[PDB]
């Protein structure tokens, strides 16, 4: 059974730098190894096939090497546009299932930029929503870097652990920042039990956690 181990899980480099991704195969697959690039919201696109041969129009700053068991992809001249996920896959398959067109786990290429703290906005639930019996409080962390960031909700200074949903965009190909949406969902009744609703935010670009809050009303 064929297994494709892709290391590392994540790598970051500045603009103009170099990035290396390594890939291992269970047993030798000769040179039947393809490298793919997958940008947010897009079908993967093949950069390299037969381990080292570049696809049409692909710049020579993508370099594939290796044979038998151990392969490498190196990307030089990093651009903000190369913020993507990169996959190896075997192009050798059998019927008996010794070989297969198996994909590596993937490597995320992070384009290193200067640290930026989120802008924090908070939105009380809408009157039209409360008429249906639900209250959703949204906290929005906009244009920050790097992606690590924790949000904590406090109702009347009581930590809410279990009724939040976080969601995050992928790295932006223009400003190389992230955005994050957190949503606190309550029944209309439980929402009208308290007055102070607050999200605390912790991020490396801020020296202390910051709280944006509001009083229901």
């Amino acid at each position: 059974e064929l297994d494709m181990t892709q290391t590392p899980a994540s790598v970051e480099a500045a603009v103009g730098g170099t990035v290396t991704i390594k890939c291992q195969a269970s047993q030798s697959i000769y040179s039947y190894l393809a490298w793919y690039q997958q940008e947010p919201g897009q079908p993967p696109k093949r950069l390299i096939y037969k381990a080292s041969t570049l696809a049409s129009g692909v710049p020579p700053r993508f370099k594939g090497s290796g044979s038998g068991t151990e392969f490498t992809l190196t990307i030089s001249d990093l651009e903000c546009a190369d913020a993507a996920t990169y996959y190896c896959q075997s192009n050798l398959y059998s019927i008996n299932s010794d070989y297969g067109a198996a994909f590596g786990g993937g490597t995320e290429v992070v384009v290193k930029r200067t640290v930026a703290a989120p802008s924090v906005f908070i939105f009380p639930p809408s009157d039209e929503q409360l008429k249906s019996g639900t209250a959703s409080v949204v906290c929005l962390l906009n244009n920050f870097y790097p992606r690590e960031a924790k949000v904590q909700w406090k109702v009347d200074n009581a930590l809410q652990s279990g009724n939040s949903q976080e969601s995050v965009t992928e790295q932006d190909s223009k400003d190389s920042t992230y955005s994050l949406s957190s949503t606190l969902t309550l029944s209309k009744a439980d929402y009208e039990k308290h007055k102070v609703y607050a999200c605390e935010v912790t991020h490396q670009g801020l020296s202390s956690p910051v709280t944006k809050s509001f009083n229901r009303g």
């Binding site: 299932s97 993937g106 809408s126 929503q129 995050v168 965009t169």
Partner: protein, 217 residues
């Protein structure tokens, strides 16, 4: 030089899944077709491929419950039974890929969801801008697209006339089994009151279109 999947959507856990990949642009003979899938937020997973040879190759996990057929009048098919709510929910891709030639393209993908739940249209709630959503010159507003099923839902602003500043986040699956989505945009705060901001939501599975006006509060 194009491929397109079809016949996706909501499937019941006992159901049998059937997709079709229509290749229009190249003679099917002597061109391998692969089926890859991607669970939301996860890596690529190869299902199987049917060579130009005519032979058929399967990943070990799909070999017992999957058949790939071709009807060489521009057609190839994937049947999968034992539909597992958990595992089989994902985006399914078909790709023309040559292990040895520079011929390779993927389709856009088609959503497949396995669930005993049924289709529900979305509710669109405003994220009105206010002082808790302003930062001097900038103000945030948006849409909460709540409680719909299955994916997906597309979100525009002023019928596509607003794209810079727009962040549409990946949908999240709630404790209720429904999806929720948030779309936000930073606009000039002085522009509020004179410039109108309309959220265009399309949810083709339930064939609904909504246009909520996002007004200040």
């Amino acid at each position: 030089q194009s491929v397109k999947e079809s016949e996706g959507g909501l499937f019941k856990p006992t159901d049998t899944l059937t997709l079709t990949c229509t290749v229009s642009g190249f003679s099917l003979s002597s061109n391998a077709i692969s089926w890859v899938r991607q669970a939301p937020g996860n890596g690529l997973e190869w299902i199987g491929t049917i060579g130009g040879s005519g032979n058929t190759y399967y990943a070990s996990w799909a070999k017992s419950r999957s058949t790939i057929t071709r009807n060489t009048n521009e057609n190839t098919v994937t049947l999968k039974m034992t539909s597992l709510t958990a595992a089989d929910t994902a985006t399914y891709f078909c790709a023309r890929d040559s292990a040895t030639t520079d011929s390779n393209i993927w389709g856009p993908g088609t959503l497949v969801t396995v669930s005993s739940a049924s289709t529900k249209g979305p509710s669109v709630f405003p994220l009105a801008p206010s002082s808790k959503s302003t930062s001097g010159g900038t103000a945030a507003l948006g849409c909460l697209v709540k409680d719909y099923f299955p994916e997906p839902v597309t979100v525009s602003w002023n019928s596509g006339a607003l794209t810079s500043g727009v962040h549409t986040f990946p949908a999240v699956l709630q404790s209720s089994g429904l999806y929720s989505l948030s779309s936000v945009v930073t606009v000039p705060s002085s522009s509020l009151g004179t410039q109108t901001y309309i959220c265009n939501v399309n949810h083709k599975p339930s064939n609904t279109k909504v246009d909520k006006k996002v007004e200040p509060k």
